[PDB]
Amino acid sequence: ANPTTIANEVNTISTIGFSSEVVRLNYLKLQYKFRHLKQTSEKFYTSDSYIGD
């Protein structure tokens, strides 16, 4: 409310209120799968110009 004029005697004063707010951040975990050649098997796919089938 508006401030209180301090004149003579007074008990009822205007008040200053407070409030709190909570902010939450969410973190999500995701995954992908990929296919590749086997380590020992790459030697049979090491073509002259490139490696891989």
Added chain:
Amino acid sequence: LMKNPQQDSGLLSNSIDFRDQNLIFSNSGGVCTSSKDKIENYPAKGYPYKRGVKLSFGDGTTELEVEAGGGDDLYGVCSDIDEFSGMATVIPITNNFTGYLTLKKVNPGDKLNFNQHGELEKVKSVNAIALSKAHKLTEDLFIVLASVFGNRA
């Protein structure tokens, strides 16, 4: 129209006696006051000193004010005024009050009600009992010791 006399006096007031020195218009507050009384203040419209007050609302640009009035709109009793700031000290109708108040131009024990102009008058919806007789201060100014107990059914 003023809490203190508007014109200066020309005589030194002798302070020898101690009886009947409180029947003055400058006696602000109450005769018996509790340290637990609830005291408010509001901007004044008019001069509601020693009178019952109601709430007055304007266009909406400025806050509400208190003006002399009674009946079903009674909000409290004005007991003091600060003239510089236009402030009116108000005791709510829900709080007990005992003091000198303006009377309409009456023996102790007579029930009283606040009229339209905030003046006590002899009898309906407010507990007000005169504790003394009307003391005349001016041609149209009469004060009386009264006690307010709230609203009756």
